[PDB]
């Protein structure tokens, strides 16, 4: 795609994760499962909700138009009415349709951008304490506890606590 | 052998598709339709005010008082008026009702 | 079209649009606060992401 996250280096989505939009999945001998990211998913949902709300708000202005009766000698006024109403219909239809297309485009782009941002955050927190694969998955060099797992989920991962540990465990 | 963690996105059995300048008919997770095409094919009230109907006449015979359109009569009120296309009780004695279109417009209000 | 005992807030020429949606394709002629009439068939907005299951 554009950011390469959705349908890119992360090919398939997780049919199991129903706790949020973007999230992690961890599986070790201590436990396995998916877990959504609260802040990123909530921020994306807030952005989408505000987008939809503004789209419906700025479109609530109704263009009222009724076809009055026009006589035999009112062909010109009738044609003027028809042309005006048809032009307004064409303008509104074009505007709505192209707005829908462009908004879906940039919305999907925002989604995959959020995915890539989460992945790059996890990358920046694990500079050399973990290896990276071509599927958006990180392989810790030193085995992390579930508490370290949350410390990565919340973003409070402590680097000097595991620096020497990963530096020793990384070669073997 | 080794620990692992992944970064993914939500997926489900959604088969609703959207369009986009780049790709079209693309299945999305959540889609919201903004257009409404399903309707109740009848005539209801507006502000709980009863509309008006002729069902055999035109507005001409109605306000002129054609003896076959006397069901509408006296003090009346409405919000919108319905005129049937195949009516036959209009102007009985032949003639021209001047500014009839303006009369219909002023009656609609 | 017939007149039936029905309570609504939006009356179109060819029926009734009792909905909360913002658009419609029924007709432009109405009385009340009806949605806007457009030539489109569907105006779906993608709120989520691309559905790629495994």
């Amino acid at each position, epitope marked *: 795609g554009i950011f390469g996250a959705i349908a890119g280096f992360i090919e398939g989505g997780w049919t199991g994760m129903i706790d949020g939009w973007y999230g992690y999945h961890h599986e070790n001998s201590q436990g396995s499962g998916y877990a959504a990211d609260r802040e990123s998913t909530q921020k994306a949902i807030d952005g989408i909700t505000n987008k939809v709300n503004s789209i*419906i708000n700025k479109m609530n202005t109704q263009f009222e138009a009724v076809d009055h009766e026009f006589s035999n000698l009112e062909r010109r006024i009738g044609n003027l009415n028809k042309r005006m109403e048809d032009g307004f219909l064409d303008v509104w239809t074009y505007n709505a349709e192209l707005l829908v297309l462009l908004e879906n485009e940039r919305t999907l782009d925002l989604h995959d951008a959020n995915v890539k941002n989460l992945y790059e955050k996890v990358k920046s927190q694990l500079r050399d304490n973990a290896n990276d694969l071509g599927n958006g998955c990180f392989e810790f060099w030193h085995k992390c506890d579930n508490e370290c797992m949350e410390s990565v989920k919340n973003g409070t991962y402590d680097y000097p606590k595991y620096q020497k540990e990963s530096k020793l465990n990384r070669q073997g | 052998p080794g620990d692992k963690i992944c970064i993914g996105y939500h997926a489900n059995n959604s088969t609703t598709q959207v369009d986009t300048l780049l790709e079209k008919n693309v299945t999305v997770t*959540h889609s919201v339709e903004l257009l409404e095409n399903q309707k109740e094919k009848r005539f209801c009230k507006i502000m709980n005010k009863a509309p008006l109907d002729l069902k055999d006449c035109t507005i001409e015979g109605w306000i002129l008082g054609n003896p076959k359109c006397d069901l509408l009569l006296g003090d009346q009120s409405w919000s919108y008026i319905v005129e049937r296309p195949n009516a036959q009780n209009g102007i009985c004695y032949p003639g021209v009702l001047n500014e009839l279109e303006e009369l219909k417009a002023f009656i609609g209000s | 079209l017939p007149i039936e005992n029905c309570d609504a807030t939006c009356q179109t020429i060819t029926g009734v649009l009792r909905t909360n949606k913002t658009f419609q394709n029924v007709s432009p002629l109405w009385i009340g606060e009806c949605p806007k009439y457009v030539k489109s068939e569907s105006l779906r907005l993608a709120t989520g992401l691309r559905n790629v299951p495994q």
Partner: nanobody
Amino acid sequence: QVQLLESGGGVVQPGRSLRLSCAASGFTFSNYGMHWVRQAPGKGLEWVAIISFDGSKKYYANSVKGRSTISRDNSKNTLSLQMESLGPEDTALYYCAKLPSPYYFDSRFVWVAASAFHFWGQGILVTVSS
């Protein structure tokens, strides 16, 4: 507004146990997380209880943490609550109401909505004294 009704309101005696409830309608209800809030007579509010669309997250208040127990029947579309250890310190009105909560309390299908249920159902007064 939408369809709402309550059950259990009135004047209950202290020291006993209370069992209140409220049922709404108008459209689907089995897919939204509901709220229970308090209002001291005169001035003051304080949130009380949360409930998911299914009932997984309980997440009671601080003042009544583990003191009450809420429940909902999504096949009957009703939201009830049972609580013991009642005193005059809780004499107040209470509302069953949908308030803006984090996304996970709402269903997977209703995470986005144009009008996010600005509903706030009516009040139910309880007054305990001699």
